[PDB]
């Protein structure tokens, strides 16, 4: 805006392309811990087995559980 800076020093090769308080691999370590929270909860859902604790039977629909209405051979 005010004044673009004219180079006075040789430009680097990766100059066309050129997160401050935390390092690179440390950030990955923290993020894997957060993704480890999601994995841990998924395993608890496996061990909870809410499928083995359903308080009602599966629905049973009339006319052969809607065989013809669901596209089954008349």
């Amino acid at each position: 805006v005010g004044k673009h800076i004219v180079p006075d020093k040789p430009l680097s090769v990766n100059d066309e392309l050129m997160a401050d308080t935390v390092g690179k691999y440390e950030a990955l370590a923290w993020l894997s811990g957060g993704l480890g929270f999601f994995v841990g909860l998924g395993l608890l859902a496996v061990l909870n087995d809410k499928a083995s604790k359903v308080p009602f039977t599966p629905r049973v629909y009339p006319y052969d559980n809607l065989r013809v209405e669901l596209g089954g051979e008349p």
């Binding site: 359903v54 308080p55 009602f56 039977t57 629905r59 629909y61 009339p62 006319y63 809607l66 209405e69």
Partner: protein, 80 residues
């Protein structure tokens, strides 16, 4: 509770495949007014309440059915 609404009647009322249960008969007059009364919540309260009473009893029956099954797993377990 026995099927009252036949396949043709449910097909004629274009009933969603998930709602062809045992209270399909009470749904047809409920949906008929819903289209007629612009799906307004403060209308068809009578037709809605009979249908909701149905779908509640069907769930309770299937809840009672599972209670008996739950009460039979323990019979096997204590007789191990």
């Amino acid at each position: 509770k026995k099927m009252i609404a036949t396949q043709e009647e449910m097909s004629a009322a274009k009933i969603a495949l998930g709602s062809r249960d045992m209270c399909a008969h009470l749904l047809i007059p409920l949906n008929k007014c819903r289209q007629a009364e612009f799906y307004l919540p403060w209308k068809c309260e009578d037709e809605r309440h009979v249908y909701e009473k149905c779908e509640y009893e069907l769930v309770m029956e299937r809840m009672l059915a599972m209670k008996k099954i739950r009460e039979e797993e323990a019979l096997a377990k204590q007789n191990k």
